Write an enzyme that holds these catalytic residues in place. Structure first.
Site, PDB file in Angstrom:
ATOM      1  N   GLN A 248       0.819  -1.199   0.000  1.00  0.00           N
ATOM      2  CA  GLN A 248       0.000   0.000   0.000  1.00  0.00           C
ATOM      3  C   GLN A 248       0.861   1.261   0.000  1.00  0.00           C
ATOM      4  O   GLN A 248       0.641   2.170  -0.804  1.00  0.00           O
ATOM      5  CB  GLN A 248      -0.988  -0.018   1.167  1.00  0.00           C
ATOM      6  CG  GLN A 248      -2.148   0.923   0.955  1.00  0.00           C
ATOM      7  CD  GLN A 248      -2.938   1.133   2.208  1.00  0.00           C
ATOM      8  OE1 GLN A 248      -2.751   0.409   3.184  1.00  0.00           O
ATOM      9  NE2 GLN A 248      -3.846   2.110   2.195  1.00  0.00           N
TER      10      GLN A 248
ATOM     11  N   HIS B  21       1.507   3.760  -3.398  1.00  0.00           N
ATOM     12  CA  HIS B  21       0.851   5.067  -3.276  1.00  0.00           C
ATOM     13  C   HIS B  21       1.728   6.290  -3.517  1.00  0.00           C
ATOM     14  O   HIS B  21       1.251   7.429  -3.428  1.00  0.00           O
ATOM     15  CB  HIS B  21       0.048   5.165  -1.994  1.00  0.00           C
ATOM     16  CG  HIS B  21      -1.224   4.397  -2.054  1.00  0.00           C
ATOM     17  ND1 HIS B  21      -2.424   4.909  -1.610  1.00  0.00           N
ATOM     18  CD2 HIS B  21      -1.494   3.165  -2.540  1.00  0.00           C
ATOM     19  CE1 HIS B  21      -3.374   4.009  -1.791  1.00  0.00           C
ATOM     20  NE2 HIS B  21      -2.833   2.943  -2.352  1.00  0.00           N
TER      21      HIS B  21
ATOM     22  N   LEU C 298      -5.237  -2.986 -11.671  1.00  0.00           N
ATOM     23  CA  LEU C 298      -4.930  -4.361 -11.297  1.00  0.00           C
ATOM     24  C   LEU C 298      -4.330  -4.458  -9.879  1.00  0.00           C
ATOM     25  O   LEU C 298      -4.277  -5.544  -9.310  1.00  0.00           O
ATOM     26  CB  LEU C 298      -4.009  -5.004 -12.335  1.00  0.00           C
ATOM     27  CG  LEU C 298      -2.541  -4.570 -12.414  1.00  0.00           C
ATOM     28  CD1 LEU C 298      -1.665  -5.212 -11.340  1.00  0.00           C
ATOM     29  CD2 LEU C 298      -2.006  -4.918 -13.796  1.00  0.00           C
ATOM     30  N   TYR C 299      -3.881  -3.321  -9.334  1.00  0.00           N
ATOM     31  CA  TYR C 299      -3.227  -3.261  -8.024  1.00  0.00           C
ATOM     32  C   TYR C 299      -4.175  -2.978  -6.869  1.00  0.00           C
ATOM     33  O   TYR C 299      -3.741  -2.724  -5.733  1.00  0.00           O
ATOM     34  CB  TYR C 299      -2.167  -2.186  -8.036  1.00  0.00           C
ATOM     35  CG  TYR C 299      -0.843  -2.679  -7.543  1.00  0.00           C
ATOM     36  CD1 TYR C 299       0.271  -2.667  -8.382  1.00  0.00           C
ATOM     37  CD2 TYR C 299      -0.695  -3.172  -6.238  1.00  0.00           C
ATOM     38  CE1 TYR C 299       1.470  -3.121  -7.957  1.00  0.00           C
ATOM     39  CE2 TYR C 299       0.530  -3.639  -5.798  1.00  0.00           C
ATOM     40  CZ  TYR C 299       1.605  -3.600  -6.661  1.00  0.00           C
ATOM     41  OH  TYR C 299       2.828  -4.039  -6.230  1.00  0.00           O
TER      42      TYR C 299
ATOM     43  N   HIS D   1      -7.444  -5.092  -2.449  1.00  0.00           N
ATOM     44  CA  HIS D   1      -8.083  -4.968  -1.158  1.00  0.00           C
ATOM     45  C   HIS D   1      -8.390  -6.314  -0.491  1.00  0.00           C
ATOM     46  O   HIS D   1      -8.482  -6.372   0.734  1.00  0.00           O
ATOM     47  CB  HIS D   1      -9.279  -4.026  -1.215  1.00  0.00           C
ATOM     48  CG  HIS D   1      -8.890  -2.616  -1.515  1.00  0.00           C
ATOM     49  ND1 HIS D   1      -8.849  -2.114  -2.797  1.00  0.00           N
ATOM     50  CD2 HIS D   1      -8.477  -1.616  -0.704  1.00  0.00           C
ATOM     51  CE1 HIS D   1      -8.459  -0.854  -2.760  1.00  0.00           C
ATOM     52  NE2 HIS D   1      -8.221  -0.529  -1.504  1.00  0.00           N
TER      53      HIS D   1
ATOM     54  N   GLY E 236       0.925  -7.392 -14.531  1.00  0.00           N
ATOM     55  CA  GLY E 236       1.626  -6.683 -13.466  1.00  0.00           C
ATOM     56  C   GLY E 236       3.129  -6.658 -13.645  1.00  0.00           C
ATOM     57  O   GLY E 236       3.758  -5.596 -13.514  1.00  0.00           O
TER      58      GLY E 236
ATOM     59  N   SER F 289       5.721  -3.419 -13.675  1.00  0.00           N
ATOM     60  CA  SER F 289       6.614  -3.342 -12.515  1.00  0.00           C
ATOM     61  C   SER F 289       8.068  -3.171 -12.905  1.00  0.00           C
ATOM     62  O   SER F 289       8.727  -2.284 -12.408  1.00  0.00           O
ATOM     63  CB  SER F 289       6.455  -4.585 -11.644  1.00  0.00           C
ATOM     64  OG  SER F 289       7.457  -4.644 -10.644  1.00  0.00           O
TER      65      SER F 289
HETATM   66  C1  COH Z   1      -1.803  -2.417  -2.886  1.00  0.00           C
HETATM   67  C2  COH Z   1      -2.633  -2.953  -1.995  1.00  0.00           C
HETATM   68  C3  COH Z   1      -3.587  -2.063  -1.174  1.00  0.00           C
HETATM   69  C4  COH Z   1      -3.857  -2.190   0.133  1.00  0.00           C
HETATM   70  C5  COH Z   1      -3.267  -3.256   1.086  1.00  0.00           C
HETATM   71  C6  COH Z   1      -4.814  -1.153   0.500  1.00  0.00           C
HETATM   72  C7  COH Z   1      -5.352  -0.909   1.762  1.00  0.00           C
HETATM   73  C8  COH Z   1      -6.432  -0.091   2.045  1.00  0.00           C
HETATM   74  C9  COH Z   1      -7.031   0.171   3.347  1.00  0.00           C
HETATM   75  C10 COH Z   1      -6.584  -0.402   4.702  1.00  0.00           C
HETATM   76  C11 COH Z   1      -5.289  -0.376   4.986  1.00  0.00           C
HETATM   77  C12 COH Z   1      -8.065   1.003   3.185  1.00  0.00           C
HETATM   78  C13 COH Z   1      -8.995   1.540   4.308  1.00  0.00           C
HETATM   79  C14 COH Z   1      -8.155   1.314   1.770  1.00  0.00           C
HETATM   80  C15 COH Z   1      -9.102   2.125   1.185  1.00  0.00           C
HETATM   81  C16 COH Z   1      -9.048   2.710  -0.057  1.00  0.00           C
HETATM   82  N1  COH Z   1      -8.183   2.334  -1.066  1.00  0.00           N
HETATM   83 CO1  COH Z   1      -6.712   0.917  -0.932  1.00  0.00          CO
HETATM   84  N2  COH Z   1      -5.092  -0.422  -0.645  1.00  0.00           N
HETATM   85  C17 COH Z   1      -4.358  -0.951  -1.687  1.00  0.00           C
HETATM   86  C18 COH Z   1      -4.369  -0.487  -2.978  1.00  0.00           C
HETATM   87  C19 COH Z   1      -5.056   0.600  -3.466  1.00  0.00           C
HETATM   88  C20 COH Z   1      -4.742   1.307  -4.679  1.00  0.00           C
HETATM   89  C21 COH Z   1      -3.597   1.023  -5.657  1.00  0.00           C
HETATM   90  C22 COH Z   1      -5.781   2.427  -4.796  1.00  0.00           C
HETATM   91  C23 COH Z   1      -5.869   3.488  -5.916  1.00  0.00           C
HETATM   92  C24 COH Z   1      -5.147   4.715  -5.362  1.00  0.00           C
HETATM   93  C25 COH Z   1      -5.285   5.918  -6.267  1.00  0.00           C
HETATM   94  O1  COH Z   1      -5.535   5.738  -7.490  1.00  0.00           O
HETATM   95  O2  COH Z   1      -5.144   7.067  -5.778  1.00  0.00           O
HETATM   96  C26 COH Z   1      -6.635   2.274  -3.632  1.00  0.00           C
HETATM   97  C27 COH Z   1      -7.732   3.063  -3.329  1.00  0.00           C
HETATM   98  C28 COH Z   1      -8.416   3.142  -2.142  1.00  0.00           C
HETATM   99  C29 COH Z   1      -9.485   4.071  -1.785  1.00  0.00           C
HETATM  100  C30 COH Z   1     -10.047   5.197  -2.683  1.00  0.00           C
HETATM  101  C31 COH Z   1      -9.067   6.339  -2.372  1.00  0.00           C
HETATM  102  C32 COH Z   1      -9.485   7.700  -2.869  1.00  0.00           C
HETATM  103  O3  COH Z   1      -8.569   8.516  -3.209  1.00  0.00           O
HETATM  104  O4  COH Z   1     -10.719   7.972  -2.912  1.00  0.00           O
HETATM  105  C33 COH Z   1      -9.862   3.822  -0.522  1.00  0.00           C
HETATM  106  C34 COH Z   1     -10.964   4.570   0.293  1.00  0.00           C
HETATM  107  N3  COH Z   1      -6.166   1.193  -2.890  1.00  0.00           N
HETATM  108  N4  COH Z   1      -7.155   0.626   1.110  1.00  0.00           N
HETATM  109  C1  LIG Z   2       5.603   2.066 -11.421  1.00  0.00           C
HETATM  110  C2  LIG Z   2       6.757   1.508 -10.617  1.00  0.00           C
HETATM  111  C3  LIG Z   2       6.837   0.015 -10.835  1.00  0.00           C
HETATM  112  C4  LIG Z   2       7.111  -0.671  -9.535  1.00  0.00           C
HETATM  113  C5  LIG Z   2       6.008  -1.674  -9.212  1.00  0.00           C
HETATM  114  C6  LIG Z   2       6.592  -2.805  -8.367  1.00  0.00           C
HETATM  115  C7  LIG Z   2       5.986  -3.933  -8.038  1.00  0.00           C
HETATM  116  C8  LIG Z   2       4.603  -4.394  -8.480  1.00  0.00           C
HETATM  117  C9  LIG Z   2       4.598  -5.909  -8.237  1.00  0.00           C
HETATM  118  C10 LIG Z   2       3.827  -6.825  -8.826  1.00  0.00           C
HETATM  119  C11 LIG Z   2       2.732  -6.601  -9.877  1.00  0.00           C
HETATM  120  C12 LIG Z   2       1.883  -7.879  -9.992  1.00  0.00           C
HETATM  121  C13 LIG Z   2       2.329  -9.105 -10.299  1.00  0.00           C
HETATM  122  C14 LIG Z   2       3.778  -9.460 -10.663  1.00  0.00           C
HETATM  123  C15 LIG Z   2       4.572  -9.952  -9.443  1.00  0.00           C
HETATM  124  C16 LIG Z   2       5.126 -11.164  -9.332  1.00  0.00           C
HETATM  125  C17 LIG Z   2       5.008 -12.266 -10.390  1.00  0.00           C
HETATM  126  C18 LIG Z   2       6.324 -12.584 -11.108  1.00  0.00           C
HETATM  127  C19 LIG Z   2       7.335 -11.436 -11.054  1.00  0.00           C
HETATM  128  C20 LIG Z   2       8.382 -11.477 -12.187  1.00  0.00           C
HETATM  129  O1  LIG Z   2       8.298 -12.416 -13.019  1.00  0.00           O
HETATM  130  O2  LIG Z   2       9.254 -10.561 -12.200  1.00  0.00           O
HETATM  131  C21 LIG Z   2       8.932  -9.353 -12.385  1.00  0.00           C
HETATM  132  C22 LIG Z   2      10.087  -8.516 -12.944  1.00  0.00           C
HETATM  133  O3  LIG Z   2       9.888  -8.289 -14.161  1.00  0.00           O
HETATM  134  C23 LIG Z   2      10.185  -7.181 -12.198  1.00  0.00           C
HETATM  135  O4  LIG Z   2      11.321  -6.673 -12.349  1.00  0.00           O
END
Ligand code: COH
Ligand SMILES: CCCCC/C=C\C/C=C\C/C=C\C/C=C\CCCC(=O)OC[C@@H](O)CO
Ligand code: COH
Ligand SMILES: *[C@@H]1O[C@H](CO)[C@@H](O[C@@H]2O[C@H](CO)[C@@H](O[C@H]3O[C@H](CO)[C@@H](O)[C@H](O)[C@@H]3O)[C@H](O)[C@H]2NC(C)=O)[C@H](O)[C@H]1NC(C)=O
Ligand SMILES: *[C@@H]1O[C@H](CO)[C@@H](O[C@@H]2O[C@H](CO)[C@@H](O[C@H]3O[C@H](CO)[C@@H](O)[C@H](O)[C@@H]3O)[C@H](O)[C@H]2NC(C)=O)[C@H](O)[C@H]1NC(C)=O
Ligand SMILES: *[C@@H]1O[C@H](CO)[C@@H](O[C@H]2O[C@H](CO)[C@@H](O)[C@H](O)[C@H]2NC(C)=O)[C@H](O)[C@H]1NC(C)=O
Ligand SMILES: *[C@H]1O[C@@H](CO)[C@@H](O[C@@H]2O[C@H](CO)[C@@H](O)[C@H](O)[C@H]2NC(C)=O)[C@H](O)[C@H]1NC(C)=O
Ligand SMILES: CCCCC/C=C\C/C=C\C/C=C\C/C=C\CCCC(=O)OC[C@@H](O)CO
Ligand SMILES: CCCCCCCCO[C@@H]1O[C@H](CO)[C@@H](O)[C@H](O)[C@H]1O
Ligand SMILES: *[C@@H]1O[C@H](CO)[C@@H](O)[C@H](O)[C@H]1NC(C)=O
Ligand SMILES: *[C@@H]1O[C@H](CO)[C@@H](O)[C@H](O)[C@H]1NC(C)=O
EC number: 1.14.99.1
Lengths: 551, 551
Positions: free
Chosen positions: A172, A176, A353-354, A357, A495, A499
């Site tokens: 997260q 972000h 795709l990220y 939640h 992804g 990445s």
């Molecule tokens: C990567 C994994 C991940 C996790 C673990 C996580 C954990 C949590 C969490 C508890 C810790 C809460 C309460 C939320 C709640 C929210 N998340 Co996420 N989020 C995650 C990835 C994301 C992503 C990526 C976005 C889009 C962000 C953006 O585009 O600004 C998001 C968007 C949101 C939004 C909309 C935001 C807005 O700007 O309106 C809310 C609300 N959420 N999330």
């Molecule tokens: C915009 C900045 C980019 C940073 C984002 C960093 C991480 C996001 C992570 C994962 C996205 C979702 C799935 C892929 C993760 C693991 C699967 C295999 C990874 C791999 O083959 O190497 C993957 C290899 O290619 C990576 O080097």
């Protein structure tokens, strides 16, 4: 309607209208010709019979642990394989970027305007007869029904790969910095104009914000000391704008680089750790360079931290996600004799795709306490009360949810999952199968193939009618996961290239930056090359608790 | 003082302080090692011994017309030669970019702040004992003394290479899209945030400005019709800010993309030509695509014009400047199997070397009038009175001034030339010889070697004392020219890599853009690949007058 609505051009061919009712496909460099770029050239026929399936490459990397233990101990072979891992992905991402939400054709506007997320596939045209183009019904299913039938969590489904809360919050926090949707403008717009790992979530997006967060002594960032512990400074101290509800008292309004990080104490944990890291690196640089001033100390510490971040992301974070037996390596030099672009533009589809939640647990378990969402949200007291050491110990222990496999979105964030669907629609995303083909995958031939199961497939069949109009985001959450894995194929294949590009694309990875002088000499360079999630915690958290991304 | 003040590290080694009085050179990938990066690696000794001098290569390209005649008519060879030409000049430019006026070490701020011009060499440190480091006197010579003794024109010196006023004004028009100093912030700051050939001088730097300039019908730019002739629209109609003296009539306050273009009727000549070109291309595309809307017609014509510009600049403009018998070619495909970064950042020194004010004649000869500077400045009446046809005919036949060779800067712009010197000093530019080493040339050993002459050399020796502290900008204007040429070695060896980088760096040259679909199909693509200075004038100027860059 637009003659390209049906997406007739295959194999990365570009569609263009040629009159009101006809289209032409541009098959340049696709390795295919014909009306629809479906007839393979001779070298392409030879490449396709000899090219392994993405699922075969995955199987090889996730089995033969015995052979990988050997491979991992022959530096020359480890280099060679990591080189392949890096380059085989590269060709999939447009760089310089192309489309966006407003431009389904290439334009200087889409190229030059950093406020847009870019787009891996152009949007469906505004006048298409169906949401996805030509196939499917006049309307897509109610997003509330898609959400309730196949996305929402009944019983919590733990991640079989063992991902913990250190991992979920790191995901997260890390992501972000580059996913910062500009809601004033719309879901296809971003406030992260650096488009990658610039650490603006620590230093602030604008120079004015950075200057308010900086101490201007020893390169350091402002901080406060609470009960002998170093925490971020407050909003009143800095004048830095943060998002907090009204009921949050001045003293609990911590000011960090990224405006939203007061939302979650899991985010504040990482913000505090990275703040300490920056100031720790300042201390080291100052010891190496007694002659340096504040500005150079600050800037050099930032570059080191950026390097640490990429190092940790590849070797602990992606390593953990991958389930690979092969030991991934952060080594910019592996790209030096290759064709690669040291630039990145964040794709909307990468943001989408990220939305992991389903990683979120039902309650947040710190020490002997079991906090609900209601209790955890915006509560930095919880952080002050337990301390970073306990936060690390507890989160290292607590398992996260499975992302793929369906029905694992916590009910507490149901409105967020609904918005990912609605906003995908509003941004006119092409279908799941269109995205699969774009990323060199076979389109799914049925809903049962997508889910690997019968019940959800049947719900989806009733809602969407046609597999070729199934949407990308819900598909990722209901996809048949790899065996004992957190994700399925589509998540990995979309992804991974986004990445690699964002990590290796960074200018610190280019030959003119990748030198010990860039980081203050050999000591600073070594901080980057030995960084890990464990050392980050060990160096910056009292008692040096053990940690990792698995339970 | 800073221990790197003496510039100890050679061969693109990087210098870094290690205490108050010590430095370390970072010799990474220089092909040298030792304390100052002066000992060559074995493979480097060989590469050195074989590699021909830049002058020898210049001699080969400007002689043996018989051989070049063959090569030029044999496509495979022309292509192989151009590919060499493109890739040799490449490794000389840092990309991703590095230093700027405020950053003599690498930093995220220097990487990411697009408001700076970048720097080929870092600035001299603030606390150095002399202006250039450690050599020379405590003060460089009075800049008026330098200007008056060796820069100011006594008698008009015509360009022996035959450059005309069509060339002179094309140079000014073209370069003023990327040299746009933000004088509110300082000389090391630019307003051209696209950092290259984006045609903002036609379309506007901001969306706000573009939109006020656009017709919103058929992709076209707004215009007015005066005496049956198409000219740019007025400030009053568009509400577009332009720099104009209070006295200019409403109707001669032409509004174009670049705010300063009303300064010179020469500039307004090209602004008008390019406006006509854009709308002409609209007409062609509208014919090709009756189904397209205004926005796509506009954006597509813009990409087309960008391509047109690159094509003309390479095959007409650089071709003419180069004196080569070999025929340069614009062909993005030649880099597709090469390592090349599709990105550019405008360097301050590129701006500096491009102050070609000696090009300017004593009067501006149109039809049978000879306009003084005073009469010609801000006088769009002259353009209306004579028309574009006469402008072209007259400026094609009028010779421009020689740039190198000394004493040829018109008194009318003496203040600009003085400012070039003072601003170099303010931006803390390293010396001429540091720049020559940076671009793989031997440092000059005396002033007479620089000028190839006795008298200016002696004035310079008295003014500067040491050749190693001679300044870049005046050196470029006093340098011994190549035989019968407009420039000397240093102008060519610095200017060429900055040029080709900014031309080929453009995203339209990348594999994902260089396709017919990008430009509306084969017809738009062909507009680009057949563009010439002659065709631009022929298509847009009544009577299709003959034109070229040489008299
Ligand atoms: C990567 C994994 C991940 C996790 C673990 C996580 C954990 C949590 C969490 C508890 C810790 C809460 C309460 C939320 C709640 C929210 N998340 Co996420 N989020 C995650 C990835 C994301 C992503 C990526 C976005 C889009 C962000 C953006 O585009 O600004 C998001 C968007 C949101 C939004 C909309 C935001 C807005 O700007 O309106 C809310 C609300 N959420 N999330
Ligand atoms: C915009 C900045 C980019 C940073 C984002 C960093 C991480 C996001 C992570 C994962 C996205 C979702 C799935 C892929 C993760 C693991 C699967 C295999 C990874 C791999 O083959 O190497 C993957 C290899 O290619 C990576 O080097
Ligand atoms: C390339 C050839 C060239 C020509 C032919 C040319 C022709 C002429 C010309 C003929 C009518 C006049 C009256 C001037 C007058 C000026 N030019 Co030039 N300039 C040229 C190259 C440049 C460059 C390069 C700059 C720096 C632009 C910047 O930094 O914004 C410049 C800047 C200037 C400046 C000071 C900066 C500013 O305020 O814009 C003045 C005054 N001038 N110039
Ligand atoms: C990148 O693209 C953004 C979206 O197009 C753009 O934002 C838009 O900017 C325009 C022009 O500045 C704004 O339009 C304003 O002016 C018009 C007419 O004068 C008014 O009718 C509007 O209400 C408005 O005030 C838009 O508000 C804005 N559109 C958005 C945010 O969706 C950015 O400016 C572009 N970035 C760059 C660097 O050009
Ligand atoms: C691009 O880098 C630029 C060069 O530093 C930078 O310009 C500078 O911006 C800062 C902060 O916004 C200004 O400093 C401010 O300091 C205090 C605020 O407490 C005020 O009293 C000052 O008036 C001023 O607002 C500098 O004045 C400014 N320097 C200039 C104009 O030369 C840009 O902001 C950087 N761009 C980005 C996008 O970060
Ligand atoms: C080109 O590709 C397109 C795919 O859309 C084909 O278009 C037609 O083919 C259909 C079945 O073969 C017909 O039912 C339709 O006339 C039309 N489809 C649509 C969506 O309108 C076309 O056959 C392809 N041609 C080649 C060379 O394979
Ligand atoms: C390469 O770098 C230079 C550093 O400038 C050189 O040091 C110079 O040595 C001269 C000869 O003894 C001295 O006159 C002078 O003190 C010194 N220059 C300065 C400005 O300090 C190094 O010796 C050389 N290093 C090597 C190993 O060749
Ligand atoms: C920022 C976008 C870049 C656009 C710059 C466009 C034009 C500038 C034109 C020439 C370079 C500048 C100054 C003089 C240097 C070289 C010209 C003379 C010889 C030459 O170019 O050939 C050398 C040979 O290598 C052929 O290239
Ligand atoms: C237009 C030139 C005005 C400059 C006058 C003041 C500086 C005089 O400078 C002198 O000019 C002489 C004539 O060119 C030269 O012979 C001398 O070498 C030079 O020093
Ligand atoms: C805030 O979190 C704390 C833990 O320190 C908890 O005891 C308290 O109930 C929470 N307050 C709210 C309003 O949820
Ligand atoms: C303006 O240019 C015109 C050419 O038509 C000329 O007659 C007039 O003298 C010029 N004005 C000035 C101020 O020189």
């Amino acid at each position: 309607h637009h003659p390209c609505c049906s997406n007739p051009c295959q194999n990365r061919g570009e569609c263009m209208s040629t009159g009101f009712d006809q289209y032409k496909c541009d098959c340049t460099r696709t390795g295919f010709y014909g009306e629809n770029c479906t007839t393979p050239e001779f070298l392409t026929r030879i490449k396709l019979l000899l090219k392994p399936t993405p699922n075969t490459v995955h199987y090889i990397l996730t089995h033969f642990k015995g052979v990988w233990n050997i491979v991992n101990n022959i530096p020359f072979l480890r280099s060679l394989i990591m080189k392949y891992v890096l380059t085989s992905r590269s060709y999939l991402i447009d760089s310089p970027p192309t489309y966006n939400v407003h431009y389904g054709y290439k334009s200087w506007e889409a190229f030059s305007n950093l406020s847009y997320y870019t787009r891996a596939l152009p949007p469906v045209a505004d006048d298409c007869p169906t949401p996805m183009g030509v196939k499917g019904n006049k309307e897509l299913p109610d997003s509330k029904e898609v959400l309730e039938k196949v996305l929402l969590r009944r019983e919590f489904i733990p991640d079989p790969q063992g991902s913990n809360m250190m991992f979920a919050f790191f995901a997260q926090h890390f992501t972000h910095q580059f996913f910062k949707t500009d809601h004033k403008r719309g879901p296809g717009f971003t406030r992260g104009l650096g488009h990658g790992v610039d650490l603006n979530h620590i230093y602030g997006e604008t120079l004015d914000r950075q200057h308010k967060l900086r101490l201007f002594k020893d390169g350091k960032l402002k901080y406060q000391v609470i009960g002998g512990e170093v925490y971020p400074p407050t909003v009143k101290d800095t004048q830095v704008e943060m998002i907090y509800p009204p009921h949050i008292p001045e003293n609990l309004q911590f000011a960090v680089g990224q405006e939203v990080f007061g939302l979650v104490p899991g985010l504040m944990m990482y913000a505090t750790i990275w703040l300490r890291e920056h100031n720790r690196v300042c201390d080291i640089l100052k010891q190496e360079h007694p002659e340096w001033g504040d500005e150079q100390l600050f800037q050099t510490s930032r570059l080191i931290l950026i390097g640490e971040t990429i190092k940790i992301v590849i070797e602990d974070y992606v390593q953990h996600l991958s389930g690979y037996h092969f030991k991934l390596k952060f080594d910019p030099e592996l790209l030096f004799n290759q064709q690669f672009q040291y630039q990145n533009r964040i794709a909307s589809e990468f943001n989408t795709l990220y939305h992991w939640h389903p990683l979120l647990p039902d309650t947040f378990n710190i020490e002997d306490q079991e906090y609900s969402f209601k209790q955890f949200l915006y509560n930095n007291s919880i952080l002050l009360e337990h301390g970073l050491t306990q936060f690390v110990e507890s989160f290292t222990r607590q398992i996260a949810g499975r992302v793929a496999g369906g029905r694992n979105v916590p009910i507490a964030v149901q409105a967020v999952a609904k918005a990912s669907i609605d906003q995908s629609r509003e941004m006119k995303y092409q279908s799941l199968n269109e995205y699969r083909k774009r990323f060199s995958l076979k389109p799914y031939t049925s809903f049962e193939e997508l889910t690997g199961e019968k019940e959800m497939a049947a719900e989806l069949k009733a809602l969407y009618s046609d597999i070729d109009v199934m949407e990308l985001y819900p598909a990722l959450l209901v996809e048949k996961p790899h065996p004992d894995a957190i994700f399925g194929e589509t998540m990995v294949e979309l992804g991974a290239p986004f990445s690699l590009k964002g990590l290796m694309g960074n200018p610190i990875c280019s030959p003119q930056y990748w030198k010990p002088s860039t980081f203050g000499g050999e000591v600073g360079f070594k901080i980057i090359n030995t960084a890990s999630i464990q050392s980050l915690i060990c160096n910056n958290v009292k008692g040096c608790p053990f940690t990792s991304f698995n339970v």
